[model samples]
Target: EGCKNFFKTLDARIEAVDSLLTVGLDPHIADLPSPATAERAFVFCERIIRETLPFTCCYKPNSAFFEAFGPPGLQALERVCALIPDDVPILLDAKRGDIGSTAQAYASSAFDAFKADGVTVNAYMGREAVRPFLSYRNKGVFVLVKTSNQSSNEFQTLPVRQDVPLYVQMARVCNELAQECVSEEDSPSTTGHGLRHNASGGGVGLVVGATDIEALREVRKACPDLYILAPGVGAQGADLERALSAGLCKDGKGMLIPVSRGISRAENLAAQANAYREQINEVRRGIVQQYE
Candidate 1:
């Protein structure tokens, strides 16, 4: 009863709230409602979390935003993380990539120090770079597939093989690593580490942009059951309607729509978040009806 996986935990909360929204807690110095200070940053984020919590399934805090101010900024992040209700999973948007030991250090800091339920990691370093994070079977590890930046295609769209793009190949590689890491056994063995044994599914996920619906659809097919975190819905001008159409999972719970400025910058946080939640559910219902 005490050892539910992170994805399962996320799924349960998403069902409870009936939201696919993952609020992005990126506290910019300029965007702060009050004077800039570490304490103010904490309060700012806490307020945002409180207002948006009821309507969101996940909370994502980009590390760079916090790291901008150095040590004190990190302290603010810890406080903000604590303010998040336990039911909602926090996905730290760190995008860490490195050698195995360094990757393990990043994982340790994110999972142990910051108490994040999941993190985003760069997959360009190959399987070894990702394996450390994947070792945490109960925690979610999202590998960057196709990013939301305008220049992502500069490298991502380059041909890897006949008709295959680098992003597609990367997606396939991440999926394979996910399957390898997720144990298929029905029961846990004493010899295996407690967290890594007999997990339900690979805890690995992919980061696809809502702006690239075709890539989103392709990646969805690449990793049929893996959770997908799609950013760029609001400030990046991605269409929520098209995102919902292309991003939902088979059971309709595997997609996360993370919006940073859209909900945070609003004058009425509740109104904005609740509106998005309702719209998402409405779209989800329509998709379900179409299948029915």
Candidate 2:
């Protein structure tokens, strides 16, 4: 083991397996195995999940992918939800937003029906939309800030607070909501550290694009406590070190990196996941030392 520990697992099957490597279970129609039926969708994820569970403590399943298959797809989703171990967290990437009643309905489906431990929410519709999800104080509400899309800047970078971008403004609101949630007697995540301990999957988290390094850093500095789900880590191919460095909390523990195609497309699912986990940790180590 010499070349970065011999690139080891070395000559052994490109093999061996520590893993935040929150695997994104996005079963694209084209990406599904065999017949590519809704059932195969679940089977595809199942086989890999069984192998890669050790490398992933979180699974972000984008509802859109499953919904594409209609009722069968939806049922597959429930099975996928049931498949996840209770110890890990499932983030439903629904990005739901609407009036209070509709928001509550969406929240119910994501947290209660689908059994998601977390849900990515759209905060743009204002307080009415966010409060419903927040009321589910047992689950995580990850507010979308700067999304990993090509045109996200069209709105996210707007000057909502004079000089502050809309994304920063949104993150501030998320931070405020998190603090308010923790103060409530029934909120499960209250602690001496408050939002700093948000990785526990309660209160608020932010979805800041890994590609938007500038926004990621801005949100990190402004809301130093909130956990970030940086989704464009690999497919969008942002510079890994810079992205991780920008999004990490001072303690180096509050960023959730979700890669869908990267790990899922690998020849050996578990091995690639293991490599990703180690790669992320290595970058994390460098950042923490730099912070110190």
Candidate 3:
């Protein structure tokens, strides 16, 4: 069954909150509140969900963090998914890239089983591998392009046999998929395809570092009209000013600013979340004044 386009939901949610921040809920066990339960990891997430709802447009949880804890973690993810407002998308940041029927199973687990609104997939496995995910209407599949880590260059920036950089090739691949998503019969009306002419017309978007200001600008140029999912703004030293100066759309749309560690590890979680909201809003407001 098809669902709703999250970025569209995100855009409206941002307007509602007067904020474009998507607080990442990558909660960990050790960093939880005192009297933390054995299920502290999920408990932490529940509290974050409760406190962040007023400002957050979506919640992204890295699957590895949950899977590491075994059954309890999975249960937590289920609860976390169920807890989020149906309007606020839950993007499962798994970054899984595999092939064959295996990919179908992955889609089943993430969609039919976990009930995620979207998932992050590695494109190296080829487009056919990810098609199963795209089959699920209203659910988005984000391809890993450039990342926010020091070693992102180890593979992503390496030059292919062609002059195009590896990440550029990734962008090209995602571009192809975007075209494919719209024409496919199961295409969700919620995608950027339905947004406006050439409005991210590509159902594909890029994942880049929110901290790497220059790369953010370069990526924006490389994949314009695609939803950009930016990680590393919070714990990874991504300066808020730099991110807005380079990453946001001219009208201050087409971006998902993700803050994981910063909110998850704050001393006073609720206050920290509010601070996160304030930081992004201040920047988004500046963008609106200058551009929109």
Candidate 4:
């Protein structure tokens, strides 16, 4: 392998896998496989993880996937979390949006209870709610600013005072709150080195859907210092090439591509993940050559 530091942050980790895929375990009752243990989620996730390890940047087991099955589901989540490799960050997509103590509980559940390296939080709850999670050193909290779903515009696009949309405000807040998190020792990311190791940016990251390229660029401009978690690839019909051609790459690499059903449901799961690795690397390398 070339000694290139192609990816620098968690997003780089995701991008290294080709910004084309993330494996999401959103198990519905009908989707449950037979021979489920008392810990059904674990059993299912273990198989997927083992199969997909070679190809994925991260595994996101939506909390609902476990909560839906009660104790069995919850235990399964725990099992899956343990099975994931240390290099691959598992993002617990809880998207918690509560206040004060509730936020603290959510952080505890995500960090302490589940031992997830990263989790998603709803910015609507404000800075105090997010501080609990961002306080963790080197961990990630992808604050939801511009979501993938079409309906996200209902609130995120709302205008309050400035010409900036609601989502921009969230981006601004992420910039402000990050002031206390990222450390000076932390490596400066693609945008600039000024925030590297800056205390405020630690534990801070952004969640922008790949389907919204316009929003993606806007969010990037709004929080140039923060890493972006761009969801919605394969199944959502997002064109990774378009994004890359449109200058989605950070420094030289672009966003982390998360694929769920595309890989999980593939007949040969490992092969599915491997293909993703090749695809992403090709595009990333292409971008580096094209622009740099």
Model 2 lDDT tens row, 61-162: 889999999999999999998898756677888889999989999989987798777888998888788889877756777889899999996988889743
Per-residue CA lDDT of model 1 for 1-292, tens digit only, reads 5363567678789889889989998989898755677777788788888888888898999999889878999999998887877778889999999999899999999888998888999988898888898777778888899998899989998888748888989989877776577546543545332222225423788899989988888887787767788888889998888987887865566788898889888999978998888888888887777766
Q: Pick the candidate with the highest lDDT.
A: 1
lDDT of 4 by residue, 1-292 (tens): 2111112344455555544356787665555667544365566677888888766777788998688778877787887787877667778899998887788888888878887877889878688879887666556777898888889888888886838888988888887777656534445555463442233223566788878877877877776656567777787888766554443544544355677777767788888777876766676676667655
Sort order, TM-score high to low: 1, 2, 3, 4
Runs in model 2 lying further than 4 Å from the true structure: 1-18, 185-192, 197-201, 290-292
Give lDDT tens digits, candidate 3, residues 177-247.
Answer: 76666654444555433421123211455788886777777777766666778888767887887787687
Worst 10 residues of 3 by lDDT: 193-202
- Candidate 4: residue 63 Cα off by (Å): 0.5
lDDT of each: 0.82, 0.77, 0.74, 0.70
What number of backbone clashes does candidate 2 have, counting pairs of residues 3 or more apart or in separate chains?
1
For model 2, state the Cα shift of residue 141 in Å. Answer: 0.6
- Name the better of 1 and 3 by lDDT: 1
What's the lDDT for residue 32 in model 2? 76
Q: In order, how many clashes per candidate?
A: 0, 1, 1, 27
By lDDT: ranked, best first = 1, 2, 3, 4
User: What's the CA error at residue 157 for candidate 4, in Å?
Assistant: 1.7
- What TM-score does each of the candidates earn? 0.92, 0.88, 0.87, 0.84
